[PDB]
């Protein structure tokens, strides 16, 4: 009687997102001092925007468009979200209007104020930044054209790196049962994420699922904490395999299925026989999420 939540990881590839805050003639990316080192990060807002973009791409109706305007970035094509259906897919439906639609006298619907479903965390890298730098040609557009030229040509430089990202869902409750079809579509959209960051078309980075593993009974999250993991290793495996071997009877491994994409290639039989005969199938994320939805329709 809950909503399951998990953690995803991405295949390594060069970074794309330049996070502005440019100083002198260089573009940089924000860092965090996790243990005195550098790490590239992404705010959850970009993932929310990209997921809504995939929802509109799949054909699910919505009532909001962010279109490329010539003057300044803005969002339009939105009307009063009177029904919870046909709008915003049961999430992110804010409103702060001071005088609107006779409040509820003729709206006759809930204010939809300070409401959210599927609150997601923010992405973190797994490898420290080594102070890389790649220079940049950047010649002037023209010396004779009618259009301007910035009066000169410069020589820029930007930094890139290759690093995977991990990302938790943090979706719980049971109120999201009005539209199970919408839930399945949203799960498929997450499974089919690509170009989540707004970084740039060239050198594009895409978030494909890679060994997404987490589950729990109708109790609040604990145990693995979604972070504190090593890089390009078996953090999934080492962490939860060790915990479950220590907690085979303490926590139910039947509902909390297997972990790690590498163990799908070797020692799968030994781990399965030592732990349980549960629904620990792991071949591809697509069919995995398919059976998650199959088991979730009943709950």
């Amino acid at each position: 009687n809950l909503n399951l939540f998990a953690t995803i990881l991405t295949y390594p590839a060069p970074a794309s997102n330049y996070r502005g805050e440019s100083e002198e003639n260089r573009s940089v990316i924000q860092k965090i001092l996790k243990d005195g080192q550098k790490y590239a990060i992404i705010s959850p807002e970009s993932m929310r925007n990209a997921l809504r973009e995939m929802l509109i791409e799949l054909g699910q109706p919505n009532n909001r468009t962010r279109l490329h305007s010539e003057d300044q970035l803005a969002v339009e094509f939105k009307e009063y979200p009177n029904p919870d259906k046909f709008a915003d897919d049961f999430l992110f439906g804010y409103m702060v209007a001071q005088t609107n639609d006779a409040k509820e006298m003729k709206k006759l619907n809930r204010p939809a104020k300070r409401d959210s479903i599927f609150r997601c965390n923010m992405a973190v890298a797994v490898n420290p930044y080594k102070y890389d730098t790649v220079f940049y040609q950047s010649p002037l557009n023209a010396g004779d054209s009618a259009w301007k030229n910035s009066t000169s040509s410069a020589l820029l430089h930007r930094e890139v790196t290759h690093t995977a990202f991990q990302y938790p869902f943090a979706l719980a409750g049971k109120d999201c049962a009005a539209k199970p079809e919408w839930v399945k579509a949203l799960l498929q959209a997450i499974a089919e994420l690509n170009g989540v960051a707004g970084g740039h078309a060239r050198a594009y980075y895409e978030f494909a699922p890679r060994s997404v593993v987490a589950r729990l009974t109708p109790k609040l999250v604990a145990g693995y904490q979604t972070y504190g993991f090593d890089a390009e290793g078996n953090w999934l495996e080492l962490s939860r395999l060790t915990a479950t071997d220590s907690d085979n009877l303490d926590l139910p491994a039947n509902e909390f299925w297997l972990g790690g994409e590498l163990v799908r290639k070797m020692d799968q039989e030994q781990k399965a026989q030592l732990e349980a005969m549960g629904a620990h199938l792991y071949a591809n994320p697509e069919k995995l999420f398919a059976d998650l939805a199959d088991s979730f329709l009943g709950v």
């Binding site: 002198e24 003639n25 260089r26 102070y131 730098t133 430089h157």
Partner: protein, 178 residues
């Protein structure tokens, strides 16, 4: 501690970044002087061109020449860099600054070779830096060549030693005429 910085005249903006590292964990973090990274990041872009200009007032005598076995580990780097530069410059043409200072009209010709022999090595160490490749460049540092029981530090830190070899190499950079 802050009262000390004003004593040095015309502090370069790179050594000035010592104020940044002034901040049961971070009480004594300044003593390791881990300023190679951010000091190098900005110095690369526009001031690799300008480093030849006025030596930024000798870089405050290159941090006042480290303001003067871990202390011996710091001192052997200073000794080794000076020995390397002097021995290499001698083996190139067998000209000695002791005789050069004696006669006029020949100081700057010596100094130009000193400049062009130090900057190339400094730039060679500037790039191609990682865990393993860096230690192989120590062959060049001891090219014209107890005392071995410190590999348990060299093979482990790989950054403090790199920072010392980078900064102290600029100590042998020529002093300005005035």
């Amino acid at each position: 501690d802050y009262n000390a910085i004003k004593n040095s005249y015309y502090c370069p903006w790179f050594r000035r970044q010592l104020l940044l590292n002034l901040v049961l964990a971070s009480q004594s973090w300044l003593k390791r002087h881990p300023w190679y990274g951010f000091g190098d990041l900005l110095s690369r872009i526009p001031q690799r061109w300008l480093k030849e200009n006025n030596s930024y007032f000798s870089h405050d005598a290159r941090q006042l020449f480290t303001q003067k076995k871990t202390r011996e580990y710091a001192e052997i780097v200073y000794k080794i860099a000076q020995g390397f530069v002097l021995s290499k410059l001698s083996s190139k043409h067998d000209l000695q600054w002791s005789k050069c200072k004696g006669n006029p009209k020949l100081e700057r010709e010596y100094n130009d070779k000193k400049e062009k022999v130090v900057n190339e090595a400094f730039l060679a160490i500037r790039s191609r830096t990682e865990k393993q490749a860096f230690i192989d460049y120590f062959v060049s540092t001891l090219y014209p060549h107890e005392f071995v029981d410190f590999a348990q530090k060299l093979f482990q830190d790989t950054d403090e030693i790199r920072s010392l070899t980078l900064l102290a190499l600029s100590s042998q950079y020529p002093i300005k005429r005035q």
